[PDB]
Amino acid sequence: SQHNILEALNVRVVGTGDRILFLAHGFGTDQSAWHLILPYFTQNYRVVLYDLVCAGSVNPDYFDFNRYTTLDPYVDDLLNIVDSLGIQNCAYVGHSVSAMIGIIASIRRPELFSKLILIGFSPRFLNDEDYHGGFEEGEIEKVFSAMEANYEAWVHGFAPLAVGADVPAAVREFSRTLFNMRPDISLFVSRTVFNSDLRGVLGLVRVPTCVIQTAKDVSVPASVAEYLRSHLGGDTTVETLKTEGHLPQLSAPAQLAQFLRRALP
């Protein structure tokens, strides 16, 4: 139930250091997205990885549509893993939805995180009055229709856009993990995430935070970076990668590793 979570979400611990580094993947991927970055840190860090319940590498029977209606159960899962491993202090790297999860988690448990590293992070995707998130409700409904009508065609068109840079290996990988997801789960999670809004709680963040924005993220306008600088409550830094795309850990691992290396405690 809540009790076999380590096996259910493929929790793996690698590396040698005392300092615990948590690598948390985002939408459409699983923990294998970190495999190019991982060798940069395993000599100096104790690295914890897991898969979100919605990952295609997780048994889809674990995805309870009745439960996973907001981000809060996802946060519960993260903290359950943390507590189950007996982790009292760690550095946390969250990509995409895992960035959103980490924000909430750090408000709940400020003492747990020495540092938040947020990659491809947005507090809100939908545009509001005086807020450019990058999407509109009508647009999103058409995406959901395409996903339902022919998920695989959608993935085929989407994966290259999301990877952004001309790195076929990265596109192929992101496609693979998207195709592994059960289509109805992908759609449901997308609905959940698109209708989330963390703008109200950004000021409550107390933990030191590094935001790593990419050059041209389909999910995150450049304006969001400055917004986060203005609104995040903790000691915050914002930095921009020179490479384009939503998935730097696959498309530009050397550059991402460099940024991480100097941001990490």
Q: Residues interacting with ligand A1L1M, by CB under 6 A?
A: 26-28, 96-97, 120, 125, 143, 158, 161-162, 190, 193-194, 218-219, 246
Quote the least distance from Cβ 140 to ligand A1L1M, whole Å.
7
Quote the least distance from Cβ 214 to ligand A1L1M, whole Å.
11
Pick from 93, 136, 112, 137: nearest CA to 257: 93
- Residue 45 or 50 having the CB closest to ligand A1L1M: 50
Residue nearest to ligand A1L1M (CB): 96
Q: H/E element holding 246? A: none
What distances in angstroms separate CA 22 from CA 67, 114, 249, 260, one per listed residue?
24, 11, 14, 12
- Residue 26 or 221 having the CB closest to ligand A1L1M: 26
| Positive/negative CA dihedral, 60, 99, 127, 249 | negative
- Residue 49 or 101 having the CB closest to ligand A1L1M: 101
Distance CA 217, CA 91 (A): 24
Burial of 215 (0-12, 13-18, 19+ CB in 10 A): middle
Could you give the residue numbers annotated as active site? 96, 217, 246
Quote the least distance from Cβ 192 to ligand A1L1M, whole Å.
8
